Design a protein around this ligand. Structure first.
Ligand SMILES: O=[N+]([O-])c1cc(S(=O)(=O)C(F)F)ccc1Oc1cc(F)cc(Br)c1
Lengths: 107, 107
């Protein structure tokens, strides 16, 4: 169970695939415009900020992070988010971050 | 004339290259509705004259983890072809995430 999101380099959701409803319970519009960190368990928040900071330094390769995401039922679900930057080489527009977000076991 | 976001769309594929998700931006650009792509391999859609080069590019993706396709043609929904370029990234293998950029109108 997974869904795709795009983020600005700050962490804000700018696109959310509707498979999020079955993965974490929210409609896309409940995620759009908020920072992913707003859905992250307080122990994991700094890891996730530092992951978004680093993924831009990794020359477009994949960075993974595991963290606890707050479902629409206010329960903590373990997620594995694999992220990479994309910048269209015909332009000099700011890169953005593409994430795949899967509910995973912590075992 | 179209801006960059409107010519780019994301897609996800299983490791057998079948579409598992596609952004609705493809409809305006190539004619397909995302739900009619699901379960169909990318190979159904490459121009005959690109098929050998794409097979090599898939090998390269499976050996390196991440590849840029170079220019190739997608069969459009009502016939003819659109030129695209793709960045493909394997998510580890679980799925392949593609960022697709249209280089042409339907020809
Ligand atoms: O199937 N793919 O993983 C994929 C990889 C690549 S790749 O560059 O990583 C390489 F494997 F060929 C390219 C295209 C790919 O799929 C398509 C996506 C589209 F929107 C349309 C068409 Br037709 C094919």
């Amino acid at each position: 169970t997974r869904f795709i999101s795009r983020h600005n380099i700050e962490g804000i959701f700018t696109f959310v695939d509707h498979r999020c409803v079955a993965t974490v319970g929210y409609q896309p519009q409940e995620l759009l415009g908020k920072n992913i960190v707003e859905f992250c368990h307080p122990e994991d928040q700094q890891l996730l900020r530092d992951s978004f900071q680093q993924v831009v330094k990794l020359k477009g390769q994949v960075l993974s992070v595991m963290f606890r995401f707050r479902s629409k039922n206010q329960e903590w679900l373990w997620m594995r988010t694999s992220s990479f930057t994309f910048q269209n080489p015909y332009s000099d527009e700011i890169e953005y971050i593409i994430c795949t977000n899967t509910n995973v076991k912590n075992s | 004339f179209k801006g960059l976001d409107s010519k780019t769309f994301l897609s996800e594929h299983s490791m057998d290259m079948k579409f598992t998700y596609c952004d609705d931006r493809i409809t305006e650009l190539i004619g397909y509705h995302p739900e009619e792509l699901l379960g169909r391999s990318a190979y159904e859609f490459y121009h005959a004259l690109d098929s050998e080069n794409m097979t090599k590019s898939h090998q390269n993706l499976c050996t390196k983890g991440q590849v840029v396709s170079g220019q190739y043609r997608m069969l459009a929904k009502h016939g003819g072809y659109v030129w695209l370029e793709t960045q493909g990234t394997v998510i580890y293998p679980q799925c392949i995430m593609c960022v697709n950029y249209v280089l042409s109108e339907i020809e």
